[PDB]
Amino acid sequence: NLQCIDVDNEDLFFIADKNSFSDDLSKNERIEYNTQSNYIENDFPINELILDTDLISKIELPSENTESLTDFNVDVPVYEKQPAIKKIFTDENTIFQYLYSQTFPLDIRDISLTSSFDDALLFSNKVYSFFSMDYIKTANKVVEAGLFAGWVKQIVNDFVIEANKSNTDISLIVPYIGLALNVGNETAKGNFENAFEIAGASILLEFIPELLIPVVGAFLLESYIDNKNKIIKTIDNALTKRNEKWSDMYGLIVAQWLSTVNTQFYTIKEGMYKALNYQAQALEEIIKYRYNIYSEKEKSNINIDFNDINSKLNEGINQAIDNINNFINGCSVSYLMKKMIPLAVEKLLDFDNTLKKNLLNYIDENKLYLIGSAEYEKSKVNKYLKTIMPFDLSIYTNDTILIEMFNKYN
Amino acid sequence: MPVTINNFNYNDPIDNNNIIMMEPPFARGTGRYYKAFKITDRIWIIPERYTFGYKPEDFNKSSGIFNRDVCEYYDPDYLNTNDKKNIFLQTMIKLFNRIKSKPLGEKLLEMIINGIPYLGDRRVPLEEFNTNIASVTVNKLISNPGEVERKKGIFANLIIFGPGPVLNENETIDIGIQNHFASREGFGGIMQMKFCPEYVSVFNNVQGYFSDPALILMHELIHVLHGLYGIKVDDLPIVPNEKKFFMQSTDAIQAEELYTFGGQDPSIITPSTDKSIYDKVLQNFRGIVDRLNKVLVCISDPNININIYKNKFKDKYKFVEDSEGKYSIDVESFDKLYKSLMFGFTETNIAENYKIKTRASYFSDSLPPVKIKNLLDNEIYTIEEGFNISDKDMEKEYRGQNKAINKQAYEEISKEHLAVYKIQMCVDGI
Ligand SMILES: [Zn+2]
C-alpha cells in the first residue's frame, strides 16, 4: 500500500524563479551632456489624486450610437480543466509530514502525545508534540473525578507556559520551532539554539536560492572636442547615473528577498500557527475522552468551566504567535542584511572601480580641452566615488513593522 | 459631469436606450443576444453566466480544477431564473452606489466612463479611424422578437457578466484580435468582467476576515481602467520555481497584477522591470499621438466627427496642443498620469480610503470562500459603511468583517462543492 500525505498547493513554499528578474543592469549605458536620471517611485499620494484637475474629464463624452459591427474576427480563449491531484514521491520529513504527525482521524478516540516523530506517523493513535516531555506525560495522566478539575486547570495552564518559552545574539528566540516543523536542514535534530548560533536564519530556509546580481555594464561617455562644459557635464551625468544603478541594484535584491526568502518565512509563520492549533486540538480530544470514561453520577458532581478553557487556549496561542512573529520577521531581515545586501554592495563597489578607471581615462583623453583643470576633476571623481548610497528599506515598504527590524542594524 | 447610477428591474421592457438586446464581443455574431442594462454611460450589466470558452458540463464540480491558486466553488443553478437575475442587478446597483459614495471611487468610475477605446487597432492605417472591430463596437438588436434581423452599433467601455463555472473567481478579460491586444498597446478596448457579489474571498492577518464585495469590484475596475487606457502591458512576469516538491505551482504573475494590488507588492517588481513597462507605455502613447496628427477619415462610419474624437482622445491621454493644432506628449503630464493609473488606484490605497480591511499581500494564503447572507439588508451591509456599520457597533477594528464577531453576515460553504488543488506526498516505499 502507498503511504500518502495530502497537502494543499497553497500551503507549500512560493519561491520565485531566477528568470523572474531582469538582467537589464548588465547593459551598457551611453552618457551624454544632457543625460538625466530615471526614478520611478512605486507610489502616488492619494490626497493629490482627488484634487488633481489634470485628471478630470474636460470634454463631453460623444454619443454611443454608431454603425453595426460586421467584422466578427476575434480570439476566443478556451478553458479546459486539469486534475486537482498531483502525485509526488519523497523520503523527506519536512514541515508537511511534521504537521500531519500532529493530526488524528475522526474514528480514533483514545490518543496519547509522544515525543517520537516516527511513532506518531506509524500508529494512528499517537500524536506528535513538540513541548517538553514533562508536559507530554502530564497530558497523558488519568486522575480521579475530584482531581480532574485540578488536572484540566493545570494542563491548560501548562500549555500557556510551554508556548511562551523564549530565551537569549539579537532579539528573541523560540527554541521549539525546529521540533515543531523540521524545516530546512535537520531542524528537529540537535539543539536549535546551538545550530542557530552557528549559521543564523539560513538553517530555517527550506531552499537557499542563487541570487541574481548582474555585473553593472560599462558606461560609454561621448567626447566633445574643445567644449569644456559638455565634458564636465558628462562626468557629472556619469556620477549621477552611478547612483541610479546602486538604487536599481538595491531594488533587485529586495524584489528577490520578498519573492524568495520572505515568502518562506511567511509559510514558517503559518506552519507554526497550524502546529499550535493541532496541539490545542490534541489536548481537547484527550480531555473529551477522559471525561466520557466517567459515569453520569461522577460528571454531574464537577462542573468544568469550558468557557474559560477556550479563552485560555486562544490567548495562549496568541501570546506565542506574537513571539514567533517577532523572531521570524527578525530572521527574514537578518538574511537580507547579512546574506544579500553585502554581496550586492561588493559588486557595486566593483562597478565604482570600473567607473573610476573609465572616468580618469576619459579625463586623460580630454586633458587638452580641459586646459589645466584635469587634476581638479580627477580629485572630484576620486572624492565622489568614496561616498556610497546607503540602503534604506523604507523606500520599498510603507507603514510597516519590518522597518523597526531594519533600523536595528549597523 | 457628476456620475449617475441608473435604476431598473430585470422585468422592465426593452426600450433600445438603457435596456437593450446586446450581442457581446465573444458571441462572434452567431445570433446569441443577451438582455443588457446600462448602469452608467459606457458601462453595461448582463446578469447572466459567463459561458464563453467554457463547456456546459464545466459548470459542475468535477475531480479537476481550472486554476491551482483558488479554492474553486461551483454552482450551476446560480442566476438560472428571472427573480435571481434581478437580485444580481440590484446588488450591482448597490455596490456601484457604494463606490461613488466617496470621491476616490467616483473618480475611478469617471475615468472608466471617459476612457473610451481608441477607434482603431494596430492594423488600422495611421490616417484612419475604424469602428468595425470587435474591441470597439458591439451590436444591439432593435427588431421585434421573431422578425427580419435589424442591428445597430453602440460604443461600450465595460460589459459586466455574472460568474463562470467558478463563482469566487472574478476576472477582467480583454479582447485579442489575431494574437494582439488593443488594451495592451495604448489603444484600449472594450473590457469584460465576470463578477459575483455573493461569494467573497476570505483572509487572515497572522501579524479570519471576509472580503467587502465593493472592494473586490473596485479591484477589478482598476484592471478595467488599465485595459481602457491600453496600459495593461505584458512584461517579464514573476514565475514560480517548480523544480522541488515543496514548491507551489502557479501561473505567471504579471507586474500589472502586483501594481493593481499595491502596497508592498510593487517592490517584487524590480526598478529595471518598472522602467521597461514605463518605456513601453510611453512608446505606445507616442504611437497614439502620431495617429491623431495624421487621422483624416473614418471609413466604417460617415457620421463620426473627426474633430470631436481628436479632442476627446487628447483629453483621454492628456496630450498637449499647440497654436497650430499639432499634438505632443508633455513628459510631466504623462508621468503624473502614468503614476496615478499604476500607483494611485490600488486595492490597498482604496481600502485605506474606504476603511475596509483587505489581505496584506497578493501571496497571502487564501481560505475557503463564504456566501454573504444578504447584501440588500441594510442591517448587514450599507452604502456608506459596508459591513462595518457603526450603529451596529461594527466600525471599530473592522468588526463588521470579522468572522468571529459578525457571524450573522455570512454562511460557510459545503466542502462537497469546493475544488482545491492538492499535492499527494507519498513516501516512495511499499
Ligand atoms: Zn487582479
Side-chain angles (χ1 to χ4, degrees):
Chain A
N1 308 324
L2 284 158
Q3 189 180 324
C4 305
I5 285 165
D6 285 10
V7 206
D8 309 285
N9 193 51
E10 298 185 38
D11 295 329
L12 310 182
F13 296 90
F14 186 99
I15 297 156
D17 199 282
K18 210 162 186 172
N19 310 309
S20 306
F21 317 101
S22 186
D23 195 22
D24 279 3
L25 276 158
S26 68
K27 290 209 264 76
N28 292 342
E29 290 277 13
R30 279 191 175 190
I31 310 295
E32 299 173 11
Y33 82 100
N34 64 344
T35 294
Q36 46 192 315
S37 276
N38 323 308
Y39 292 100
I40 304 164
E41 206 177 20
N42 300 1
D43 167 52
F44 194 85
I46 205 82
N47 67 301
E48 281 161 47
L49 164 53
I50 304 163
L51 294 163
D52 189 26
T53 315
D54 291 338
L55 304 160
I56 312 168
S57 191
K58 287 151 196 184
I59 312 288
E60 169 77 323
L61 187 70
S63 67
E64 59 187 11
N65 304 314
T66 191
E67 293 289 287
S68 303
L69 177 71
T70 55
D71 195 15
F72 297 109
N73 187 24
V74 72
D75 297 343
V76 187
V78 182
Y79 307 102
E80 59 166 28
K81 289 191 181 194
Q82 52 175 103
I85 312 158
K86 190 195 180 181
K87 219 172 192 176
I88 60 158
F89 300 89
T90 179
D91 287 295
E92 287 282 326
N93 300 359
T94 181
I95 51 157
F96 321 106
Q97 295 83 12
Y98 262 72
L99 279 164
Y100 189 84
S101 65
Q102 301 183 51
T103 76
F104 57 91
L106 297 173
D107 295 337
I108 319 292
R109 288 163 174 172
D110 187 23
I111 53 159
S112 57
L113 281 337
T114 180
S115 66
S116 188
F117 169 75
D118 294 307
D119 291 337
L121 264 180
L122 200 69
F123 302 92
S124 56
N125 72 292
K126 310 288 175 193
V127 166
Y128 179 79
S129 183
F130 49 83
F131 301 123
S132 70
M133 299 193 201
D134 206 285
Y135 160 87
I136 291 162
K137 290 190 174 190
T138 315
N140 290 328
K141 194 179 183 177
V142 196
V143 284
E144 301 290 293
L147 296 164
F148 189 73
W151 177 79
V152 174
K153 189 210 169 192
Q154 193 196 228
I155 200 62
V156 180
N157 186 62
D158 279 28
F159 187 90
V160 181
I161 307 163
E162 279 295 322
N164 290 32
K165 281 187 167 182
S166 70
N167 39 25
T168 307
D169 56 322
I170 51 175
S171 290
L172 199 59
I173 183 171
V174 185
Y176 64 73
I177 297 177
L179 284 153
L181 299 177
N182 198 56
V183 64
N185 195 52
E186 308 156 307
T187 310
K189 266 194 172 175
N191 200 43
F192 183 69
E193 296 186 51
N194 290 164
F196 193 88
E197 204 178 38
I198 294 173
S202 312
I203 52 155
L204 280 179
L205 286 171
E206 189 86 316
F207 182 71
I208 315 283
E210 293 172 354
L211 266 173
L212 179 66
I213 313 167
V215 180
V216 186
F219 280 26
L220 313 164
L221 322 202
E222 191 143 293
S223 290
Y224 304 97
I225 42 162
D226 205 22
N227 193 322
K228 192 197 188 75
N229 282 74
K230 289 193 178 187
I231 296 163
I232 296 164
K233 283 183 177 302
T234 302
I235 296 162
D236 307 356
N237 293 158
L239 295 167
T240 64
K241 189 66 81 184
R242 172 256 192 176
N243 304 322
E244 195 195 66
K245 304 289 161 191
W246 279 72
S247 176
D248 276 29
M249 185 72 90
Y250 284 143
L252 173 55
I253 302 296
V254 164
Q256 291 181 76
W257 169 63
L258 288 173
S259 64
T260 286
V261 173
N262 196 62
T263 43
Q264 293 188 63
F265 286 113
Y266 168 80
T267 309
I268 295 154
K269 276 187 280 174
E270 281 278 70
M272 288 305 294
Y273 188 71
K274 281 167 198 149
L276 289 160
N277 282 330
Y278 288 144
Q279 283 303 307
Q281 283 194 343
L283 188 70
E284 273 165 30
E285 203 74 12
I286 279 184
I287 303 163
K288 285 172 196 188
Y289 180 79
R290 306 292 184 201
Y291 187 77
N292 282 53
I293 306 302
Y294 302 112
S295 61
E296 289 180 54
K297 290 181 179 178
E298 297 167 300
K299 299 181 193 187
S300 190
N301 295 323
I302 314 296
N303 290 285
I304 304 292
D305 190 21
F306 294 101
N307 201 42
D308 180 65
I309 301 161
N310 293 56
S311 182
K312 266 189 173 182
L313 286 166
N314 181 238
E315 193 214 308
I317 301 160
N318 279 348
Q319 287 174 305
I321 280 295
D322 292 4
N323 293 335
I324 292 155
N325 286 345
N326 188 66
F327 168 66
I328 297 299
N329 288 340
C331 281
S332 191
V333 179
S334 179
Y335 195 87
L336 172 74
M337 293 310 289
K338 299 222 158 192
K339 295 293 179 181
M340 292 184 139
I341 298 297
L343 304 188
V345 176
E346 205 183 345
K347 282 214 209 305
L348 285 163
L349 293 168
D350 291 338
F351 165 64
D352 275 11
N353 282 41
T354 309
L355 188 60
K356 201 177 176 291
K357 181 191 168 213
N358 193 349
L359 285 175
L360 304 179
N361 181 253
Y362 179 83
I363 298 161
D364 274 344
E365 284 166 352
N366 299 82
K367 63 170 74 177
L368 175 56
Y369 321 112
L370 291 169
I371 319 294
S373 75
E375 298 283 3
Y376 186 80
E377 281 167 46
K378 222 89 153 163
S379 54
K380 179 196 154 194
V381 169
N382 263 69
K383 190 206 183 87
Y384 191 89
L385 298 175
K386 225 175 164 191
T387 311
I388 61 164
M389 179 204 273
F391 175 68
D392 185 6
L393 189 62
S394 70
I395 290 163
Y396 304 99
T397 186
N398 292 1
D399 176 59
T400 310
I401 303 180
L402 277 84
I403 190 190
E404 175 66 33
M405 296 288 173
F406 167 70
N407 294 137
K408 202 181 185 176
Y409 284 88
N410 292 42
Chain B
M1 77 157 193
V3 179
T4 307
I5 316 288
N6 303 325
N7 284 293
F8 55 80
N9 296 277
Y10 186 85
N11 296 346
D12 288 13
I14 294 150
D15 54 37
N16 289 308
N17 227 45
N18 282 5
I19 304 158
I20 66 163
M21 289 300 288
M22 183 189 280
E23 188 175 63
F26 288 155
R28 278 198 143 286
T30 56
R32 301 296 198 107
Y33 301 96
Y34 299 80
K35 196 177 183 172
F37 299 84
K38 191 203 280 175
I39 181 152
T40 37
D41 291 0
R42 302 296 208 278
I43 306 175
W44 295 84
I45 313 293
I46 298 175
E48 292 170 65
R49 300 295 288 274
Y50 188 89
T51 56
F52 304 101
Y54 296 103
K55 298 171 190 184
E57 57 271 25
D58 284 345
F59 286 80
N60 287 293
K61 201 275 172 181
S62 174
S63 65
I65 51 96
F66 284 111
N67 305 326
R68 332 194 204 197
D69 294 301
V70 191
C71 291
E72 299 194 322
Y73 179 73
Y74 295 83
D75 187 351
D77 294 12
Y78 186 74
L79 299 170
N80 68 328
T81 187
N82 284 9
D83 295 29
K84 280 181 191 184
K85 292 175 169 72
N86 185 236
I87 294 168
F88 197 83
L89 289 175
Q90 309 304 314
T91 313
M92 293 310 293
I93 282 164
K94 186 168 177 176
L95 292 170
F96 265 79
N97 279 326
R98 171 137 171 84
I99 289 157
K100 71 156 200 203
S101 74
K102 282 179 211 279
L104 179 59
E106 199 166 50
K107 270 219 180 167
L108 182 68
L109 286 180
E110 54 206 325
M111 300 284 290
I112 289 165
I113 295 155
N114 289 294
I116 56 161
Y118 188 94
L119 300 177
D121 209 14
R122 72 175 297 158
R123 309 170 295 152
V124 178
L126 311 172
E127 303 76 28
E128 285 188 61
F129 278 145
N130 194 10
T131 66
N132 194 38
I133 56 170
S135 60
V136 172
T137 309
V138 77
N139 291 330
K140 68 166 172 191
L141 188 70
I142 59 164
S143 305
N144 311 334
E147 200 199 334
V148 187
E149 310 156 330
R150 297 167 61 248
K151 287 181 279 180
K152 215 82 188 173
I154 56 150
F155 296 120
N157 291 11
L158 169 67
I159 306 165
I160 300 179
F161 293 85
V166 184
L167 312 187
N168 60 308
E169 196 209 307
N170 301 321
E171 205 197 336
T172 304
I173 312 97
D174 59 331
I175 292 158
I177 300 171
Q178 299 186 305
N179 196 17
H180 288 303
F181 296 87
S183 70
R184 296 185 205 176
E185 292 177 10
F187 299 95
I190 299 170
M191 296 300 280
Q192 288 173 111
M193 199 195 294
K194 46 182 206 172
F195 183 79
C196 177
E198 280 195 357
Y199 297 85
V200 296
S201 59
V202 181
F203 59 91
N204 199 356
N205 58 340
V206 187
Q207 293 173 348
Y209 293 86
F210 56 86
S211 208
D212 185 309
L215 186 58
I216 295 161
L217 175 53
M218 275 183 283
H219 175 96
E220 298 305 325
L221 289 164
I222 297 158
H223 285 306
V224 177
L225 183 54
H226 296 151
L228 290 173
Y229 266 86
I231 65 168
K232 188 178 164 179
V233 296
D234 288 333
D235 187 357
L236 180 57
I238 301 301
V239 48
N241 195 344
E242 288 188 5
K243 277 180 160 61
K244 302 295 173 190
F245 80 92
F246 53 76
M247 290 172 178
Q248 186 172 338
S249 295
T250 176
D251 297 339
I253 307 143
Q254 276 294 324
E256 194 271 342
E257 180 66 68
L258 292 177
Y259 289 167
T260 292
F261 188 88
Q264 196 195 73
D265 292 350
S267 295
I268 294 167
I269 305 303
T270 57
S272 289
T273 303
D274 282 317
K275 280 185 254 280
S276 180
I277 292 155
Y278 185 93
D279 299 340
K280 270 181 182 196
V281 169
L282 181 59
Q283 213 62 23
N284 297 341
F285 273 41
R286 289 210 202 275
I288 304 292
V289 68
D290 198 47
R291 287 192 177 258
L292 291 183
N293 287 339
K294 292 177 176 191
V295 69
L296 291 156
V297 286
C298 180
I299 47 158
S300 55
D301 187 9
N303 290 130
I304 295 294
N305 194 293
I306 312 296
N307 254 18
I308 295 306
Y309 282 91
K310 279 177 71 176
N311 278 318
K312 187 61 192 167
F313 294 132
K314 182 222 167 194
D315 189 37
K316 182 196 172 176
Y317 303 106
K318 312 299 170 180
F319 295 139
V320 288
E321 188 185 310
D322 60 34
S323 292
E324 281 178 342
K326 198 85 179 165
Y327 300 156
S328 55
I329 292 161
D330 169 35
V331 177
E332 198 182 295
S333 296
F334 171 77
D335 196 69
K336 197 184 201 181
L337 169 69
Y338 178 88
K339 290 183 183 190
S340 300
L341 295 167
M342 289 316 206
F343 310 122
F345 298 101
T346 73
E347 183 176 316
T348 299
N349 274 342
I350 289 157
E352 204 267 17
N353 198 69
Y354 273 79
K355 299 172 184 174
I356 300 170
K357 202 198 187 71
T358 190
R359 45 188 307 187
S361 184
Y362 171 92
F363 297 95
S364 294
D365 275 298
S366 208
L367 294 177
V370 292
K371 183 187 172 180
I372 300 301
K373 223 166 172 193
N374 196 0
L375 285 159
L376 296 171
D377 190 17
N378 290 307
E379 288 168 17
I380 300 299
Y381 190 88
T382 50
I383 284 165
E384 285 199 359
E385 281 184 294
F387 287 111
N388 311 320
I389 303 160
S390 58
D391 289 19
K392 293 282 171 195
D393 192 5
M394 297 284 183
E395 184 189 353
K396 271 193 175 184
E397 286 178 336
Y398 315 111
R399 266 171 54 90
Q401 297 180 83
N402 200 298
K403 280 178 77 165
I405 298 155
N406 191 350
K407 289 196 168 184
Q408 284 177 44
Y410 75 96
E411 285 184 336
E412 290 282 350
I413 280 167
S414 180
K415 294 279 185 182
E416 294 194 67
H417 295 297
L418 278 174
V420 193
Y421 191 75
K422 288 168 180 283
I423 306 294
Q424 207 166 60
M425 297 197 172
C426 312
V427 177
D428 184 8
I430 321 155

Coordinates of all heavy atoms in Angstrom, one line a residue, chain B residues 357-392:
Chain B
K357 N -11.0 46.5 5.5 CA -9.8 45.6 5.7 C -9.6 44.7 4.5 O -10.6 44.2 3.9 CB -10.0 44.8 7.0 CG -8.6 44.3 7.5 CD -8.8 43.1 8.4 CE -7.4 42.7 9.0 NZ -7.0 43.8 10.0
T358 N -8.4 44.5 4.1 CA -8.0 43.6 3.0 C -6.9 42.7 3.4 O -6.3 42.9 4.5 CB -7.8 44.4 1.7 OG1 -7.7 43.5 0.6 CG2 -6.5 45.2 1.8
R359 N -6.5 41.8 2.5 CA -5.3 41.0 2.7 C -4.0 41.8 2.7 O -4.0 42.8 2.1 CB -5.3 39.8 1.7 CG -5.6 40.2 0.3 CD -5.8 39.0 -0.6 NE -4.6 38.1 -0.6 CZ -4.4 37.1 -1.4 NH1 -5.3 36.8 -2.3 NH2 -3.3 36.3 -1.2
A360 N -3.0 41.3 3.3 CA -1.7 42.0 3.5 C -0.9 42.0 2.2 O -0.4 43.0 1.7 CB -0.9 41.5 4.6
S361 N -0.8 40.8 1.6 CA -0.1 40.6 0.3 C -0.9 39.8 -0.7 O -1.8 39.1 -0.3 CB 1.3 40.0 0.5 OG 2.1 39.9 -0.7
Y362 N -0.5 39.9 -2.0 CA -1.0 39.0 -3.0 C -0.7 37.6 -2.8 O -1.4 36.7 -3.1 CB -0.5 39.5 -4.4 CG -0.9 38.6 -5.5 CD1 -2.0 38.7 -6.3 CD2 0.0 37.5 -5.9 CE1 -2.3 37.9 -7.3 CE2 -0.3 36.7 -6.9 CZ -1.5 36.8 -7.7 OH -1.8 36.0 -8.7
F363 N 0.4 37.3 -2.1 CA 0.9 36.0 -1.9 C 0.5 35.4 -0.5 O 1.0 34.4 -0.1 CB 2.5 35.9 -2.0 CG 2.9 36.3 -3.4 CD1 3.3 37.6 -3.7 CD2 3.0 35.3 -4.4 CE1 3.7 37.9 -5.0 CE2 3.4 35.6 -5.7 CZ 3.8 36.9 -6.0
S364 N -0.5 36.1 0.1 CA -1.1 35.6 1.3 C -1.9 34.3 1.1 O -2.3 34.1 -0.1 CB -2.0 36.6 1.9 OG -1.3 37.8 2.4
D365 N -2.0 33.4 2.1 CA -2.8 32.2 2.0 C -4.2 32.5 1.8 O -4.8 33.4 2.5 CB -2.6 31.3 3.2 CG -1.4 30.4 3.1 OD1 -1.3 29.6 2.2 OD2 -0.4 30.6 4.0
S366 N -4.9 31.9 0.9 CA -6.3 32.0 0.7 C -7.1 30.9 1.4 O -6.6 29.8 1.5 CB -6.7 32.0 -0.8 OG -7.8 32.8 -1.1
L367 N -8.2 31.3 1.9 CA -9.1 30.3 2.7 C -10.4 30.1 1.9 O -10.7 30.8 1.0 CB -9.3 30.9 4.1 CG -8.1 31.0 5.1 CD1 -8.6 31.6 6.4 CD2 -7.4 29.7 5.3
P368 N -11.2 29.0 2.4 CA -12.4 28.7 1.7 C -13.3 30.0 1.7 O -13.4 30.7 2.7 CB -13.1 27.7 2.6 CG -11.9 27.0 3.3 CD -10.9 28.1 3.5
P369 N -14.0 30.3 0.5 CA -14.9 31.4 0.4 C -16.1 31.3 1.2 O -16.5 30.2 1.6 CB -15.2 31.4 -1.1 CG -15.0 30.0 -1.6 CD -13.8 29.5 -0.7
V370 N -16.8 32.4 1.5 CA -18.1 32.4 2.2 C -19.2 33.1 1.4 O -18.9 34.0 0.6 CB -18.0 33.1 3.6 CG1 -17.1 32.2 4.5 CG2 -17.4 34.5 3.5
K371 N -20.4 32.6 1.6 CA -21.6 33.2 1.0 C -22.1 34.3 1.9 O -22.3 34.1 3.1 CB -22.7 32.2 0.7 CG -23.9 32.7 0.1 CD -25.0 31.6 0.0 CE -26.3 32.2 -0.5 NZ -27.4 31.1 -0.6
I372 N -22.3 35.5 1.4 CA -22.8 36.6 2.1 C -24.4 36.5 2.2 O -25.0 36.5 1.2 CB -22.4 38.0 1.6 CG1 -20.9 38.1 1.6 CG2 -23.1 39.1 2.4 CD1 -20.2 38.0 3.0
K373 N -24.9 36.4 3.4 CA -26.3 36.1 3.7 C -27.2 37.0 2.8 O -27.9 36.5 2.0 CB -26.6 36.2 5.2 CG -27.5 35.1 5.7 CD -27.4 35.1 7.2 CE -28.5 34.1 7.8 NZ -28.7 34.3 9.3
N374 N -27.2 38.3 3.1 CA -28.0 39.3 2.3 C -27.3 40.7 2.3 O -27.2 41.4 3.3 CB -29.4 39.4 3.0 CG -30.4 40.1 2.0 OD1 -30.1 40.5 0.9 ND2 -31.6 40.2 2.5
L375 N -26.9 41.0 1.1 CA -26.3 42.3 0.8 C -27.3 43.5 0.7 O -26.9 44.6 0.8 CB -25.4 42.3 -0.5 CG -24.0 41.5 -0.3 CD1 -23.5 41.1 -1.7 CD2 -23.0 42.4 0.4
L376 N -28.5 43.1 0.4 CA -29.6 44.1 0.2 C -30.2 44.5 1.6 O -31.1 45.3 1.7 CB -30.7 43.6 -0.7 CG -30.2 43.4 -2.2 CD1 -31.3 42.7 -3.0 CD2 -29.8 44.7 -2.9
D377 N -29.8 43.8 2.6 CA -30.3 44.0 4.0 C -29.3 45.0 4.7 O -28.2 44.8 5.0 CB -30.3 42.7 4.8 CG -31.0 42.9 6.1 OD1 -31.7 43.9 6.3 OD2 -30.8 42.0 7.0
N378 N -29.9 46.2 4.9 CA -29.1 47.4 5.4 C -28.7 47.2 6.9 O -28.0 48.1 7.4 CB -29.8 48.7 5.2 CG -29.9 49.1 3.7 OD1 -28.8 49.1 3.1 ND2 -31.1 49.4 3.2
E379 N -29.0 46.1 7.5 CA -28.5 45.8 8.9 C -27.2 45.1 8.8 O -26.5 45.0 9.8 CB -29.6 45.0 9.7 CG -30.8 45.9 10.1 CD -31.9 45.0 10.6 OE1 -31.7 43.8 11.0 OE2 -33.1 45.5 10.7
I380 N -27.0 44.5 7.6 CA -25.8 43.7 7.3 C -24.8 44.5 6.6 O -23.6 44.6 7.0 CB -26.1 42.4 6.5 CG1 -27.1 41.5 7.3 CG2 -24.9 41.7 6.1 CD1 -26.5 41.0 8.6
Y381 N -25.2 45.2 5.5 CA -24.3 45.9 4.5 C -25.0 47.2 4.1 O -26.1 47.2 3.6 CB -24.0 45.0 3.3 CG -22.9 45.5 2.4 CD1 -21.6 45.2 2.6 CD2 -23.3 46.2 1.3 CE1 -20.6 45.6 1.8 CE2 -22.3 46.7 0.4 CZ -21.0 46.4 0.7 OH -20.0 46.8 -0.2
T382 N -24.3 48.3 4.2 CA -24.8 49.6 3.8 C -23.9 50.2 2.7 O -22.8 49.8 2.5 CB -24.8 50.6 5.0 OG1 -23.6 50.5 5.7 CG2 -25.9 50.2 6.0
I383 N -24.5 51.3 2.1 CA -23.8 52.0 1.0 C -22.6 52.8 1.6 O -21.5 52.9 1.0 CB -24.7 52.9 0.2 CG1 -25.6 52.1 -0.7 CG2 -24.0 54.0 -0.5 CD1 -26.8 52.8 -1.3
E384 N -22.8 53.4 2.8 CA -21.8 54.4 3.4 C -20.7 53.7 4.1 O -19.6 54.2 4.3 CB -22.5 55.4 4.2 CG -23.2 56.5 3.4 CD -23.5 57.8 4.2 OE1 -23.2 57.8 5.5 OE2 -24.1 58.8 3.7
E385 N -21.0 52.5 4.7 CA -20.1 51.8 5.6 C -19.8 50.3 5.4 O -19.0 49.7 6.1 CB -20.6 52.0 7.1 CG -20.3 53.3 7.7 CD -20.7 53.4 9.2 OE1 -21.9 53.3 9.4 OE2 -19.8 53.5 10.0
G386 N -20.4 49.8 4.3 CA -20.3 48.4 4.0 C -20.7 47.5 5.1 O -21.8 47.6 5.7
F387 N -19.9 46.5 5.6 CA -20.2 45.7 6.7 C -19.9 46.4 8.0 O -20.6 46.1 9.0 CB -19.3 44.4 6.6 CG -19.8 43.4 5.6 CD1 -19.0 43.2 4.4 CD2 -21.0 42.7 5.7 CE1 -19.4 42.3 3.4 CE2 -21.4 41.8 4.7 CZ -20.6 41.6 3.6
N388 N -18.9 47.2 8.1 CA -18.5 47.9 9.3 C -19.5 49.0 9.7 O -19.1 50.2 9.7 CB -17.1 48.4 9.2 CG -16.1 47.4 8.6 OD1 -16.2 46.2 9.0 ND2 -15.2 47.8 7.8
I389 N -20.7 48.7 10.0 CA -21.8 49.6 10.4 C -21.6 50.0 11.8 O -21.6 49.2 12.7 CB -23.2 49.0 10.2 CG1 -23.4 48.6 8.7 CG2 -24.3 50.0 10.6 CD1 -24.5 47.5 8.5
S390 N -21.5 51.3 12.1 CA -21.2 51.9 13.4 C -22.4 51.7 14.4 O -22.2 51.5 15.5 CB -20.7 53.3 13.3 OG -21.7 54.1 12.6
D391 N -23.6 52.0 13.9 CA -24.8 51.8 14.7 C -25.2 50.4 15.0 O -26.2 50.1 15.5 CB -26.0 52.6 14.0 CG -25.8 54.1 14.1 OD1 -24.7 54.6 14.3 OD2 -26.8 54.8 13.9
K392 N -24.3 49.5 14.6 CA -24.4 48.1 14.9 C -23.1 47.7 15.7 O -22.9 46.5 16.1 CB -24.5 47.2 13.7 CG -25.8 47.3 12.9 CD -27.0 46.6 13.6 CE -28.3 46.9 13.0 NZ -29.4 46.5 13.8

